[PDB]
Design a protein around this ligand. Structure first.
Ligand SMILES: [Ca+2]
Ligand SMILES: [Ca+2]
Lengths: 136, 136
């Protein structure tokens, strides 16, 4: 509906997209349910620059993003259905990650504040979250 | 993978579909994640016959089913993309449900062992679950 309005409504703006950083923590799925109801999806990271903005604006607090496995034993996909670049992700996971700790880590979160900031963790962990919505 | 091959692994067969009834409790999404790893989804309900097979096998124990909202404020649908008729479902909901308690009950389960067994509850409640894989 327009940049100023969306900004004025509390949304962040970075490079062709609106973002919503949740004021309360939810499980990955309850976070996605909210983003759908906000005409959005849990965020994707489709560049290094977008990764830079997203870790910065997270403020060192662990934020759910929109990476999830296609089934508890499947490969990662972006929920917003953009392509997942397996190779580009190398520069985005915290070293050691994805580690699949206790074989119950199928949802990914911005845990720290660096270029390498993603951690795989339990999908039922409650964290703050980022809804992504196109500027269309 | 063969009717007798599936029941020999612990799948249940009824009227053209295989169904996995779970051992351990899980949230709606993790349940669904587990489903997909076994080539299934959480179960959709198309006929009263299916409803009756499902509620009688569920034994009174609450079991998650594949009915969820298109977001926290959106419409009910089946996660396996079976078409959901609201008028047919009227028969299966517990009288007085779906109530949407605290604007928070965004997933459905088979709560009791009766025809009127569907209750809406928060997707973060941990219950046993029913996966469904179609026989082709
Ligand atoms: Ca991890
Ligand atoms: Ca209810």
């Amino acid at each position: 509906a327009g940049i100023l309005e969306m900004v004025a409504r509390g949304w962040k703006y970075f490079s062709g997209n609106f973002y919503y950083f949740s004021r309360t923590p939810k499980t990955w799925y309850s976070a996605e349910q909210f983003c759908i109801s906000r005409k959005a999806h849990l965020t994707s990271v489709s560049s290094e620059s977008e990764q830079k903005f997203l870790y910065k604006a997270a403020d060192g607090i662990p934020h759910w993003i929109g990476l999830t496995k296609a089934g508890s034993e499947g490969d990662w996909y972006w929920v917003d259905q953009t392509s997942f670049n397996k190779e580009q992700s190398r520069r985005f996971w915290i070293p050691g990650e994805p580690n699949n700790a206790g074989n119950n880590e199928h949802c990914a979160n911005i845990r720290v504040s660096a270029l390498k900031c993603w951690n795989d963790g339990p999908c039922d962990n409650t964290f703050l979250f980022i809804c992504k919505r196109p500027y269309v």
